[PDB]
């Protein structure tokens, strides 16, 4: 009746997703924009439009909040006009021209040699990859080149009258004089991860007592999909119990998300201690560094 040491693995399943309460585009990937897998209600969308061909299509929107999406690629020209528009280009090498017009527009480039015209208002461009993947140059015409390698080739996108740029790593205030990008502090950052653990004592006399998470920022909320599992106190710790068949020799917790306040630490080590028991106890632990 000696508790045998189990095996535990923790895995960051993706990079942190910074979310901003004041920017509904935050946490929406280019892919989700191109597929329509986001909440159009958060943007007050009143009309939706697509392109038609695999070549340069011109789609004009309405004076209302329009969703216009390149479903067939080719490098389409989208005119948003008035209203707060969501203009989503495609991923062909040939550029989209996305003209936001008046209102506060979301201009989603996709891949390729895209031209993004914010127009009047406070406009946001959504670019793929991280800010660090992009070279900014000033143009003679007052616009900016955003150079990025896509498919091992250097591509140039041009941005005009865009106040904000959203990358995978967050939203930046864009200085339209000198092309400075200044990081905006997120409201929260979602860190997705998984825990898997198994007993080395395989006769059913042992169960997992608990999974103890440590090293987490105070005020962080752990989720399993929908469910709130717990809020991280002063001590940086959560004791997990009852999230598995209690009989099981092997535990896999998936769909876990740690939502960290933006004011909390941009770097920490998430440690898991898997505790095996029968009267006596034994532990193993693993860590992942979260950025
Ligand atoms: Ca044992
Ligand atoms: Ca098209
Ligand atoms: Ca397109
Ligand atoms: Ca419109
Ligand atoms: Ca507009
Ligand atoms: Ca594009
Ligand atoms: Ca605009
Ligand atoms: Ca603008
Ligand atoms: Ca045993």
Numbering used by the authors: 4168 to 4458
Give passages from the manuscript.
Here, using this criterion and an AlphaFold3 model of a 5047-residue RTX adhesin from Aeromonas hydrophila, we identified three different ligand-binding domains in this fibrillar protein. In both of these bacteria, the adhesins are single polypeptide chains of the repeats-in-toxin (RTX) family that are exported through the Type I secretion system but anchored to the bacterial surface by a retention domain that folds internally and is then too large to pass through the channel of the T1SS. The crystal structures of the two novel domains were solved to 1.4 and 1.95 Å resolution, respectively, and demonstrate excellent agreement with their modeled structures.
Budding out from this second split domain is a 17-kDa putative ligand-binding domain (dark red), which AlphaFold3 suggests is an RTX-type beta-roll containing nonapeptide Ca2+-binding sequences. After these, another split domain begins (colored pink) that leads into a second putative ligand-binding domain (colored dark red) before returning to finish the split domain (pink). These two domains were expressed together, purified, and crystallized. The first section of the beta-roll domain is a short alpha-helix that runs parallel with, and leads into, a short beta-solenoid domain composed of tandem RTX nonapeptide repeats with a consensus sequence X-G-G-X-G-(N/D)-D-X-(L/I/F)-X that together bind nine Ca2+ ions on the inside of the solenoid. After four coils of the beta-roll, the domain ends in a short beta-sandwich motif before the polypeptide chain returns to complete the split domain (colored yellow to red). There is no obvious ligand-binding site on this domain, but based on observations of other split + ligand-binding domain combinations, its binding site is likely to be the most solvent-exposed surface. It bound to only one glycan slightly above background levels. It did not bind to any of the microorganisms tested, nor to the erythrocytes, but it did bind in patches to all three human endothelial cell types. AhLapRTX appears to be a novel ligand-binding domain, and there are as yet no indications of what macromolecules it might adhere to. When the crystal structures of the two putative ligand-binding domains (red and gold ribbon) are overlaid on their AlphaFold3 models (green ribbon) to compare their folds, the agreement between individual domains is extremely close, with RMSD values of below 0.5 Å.
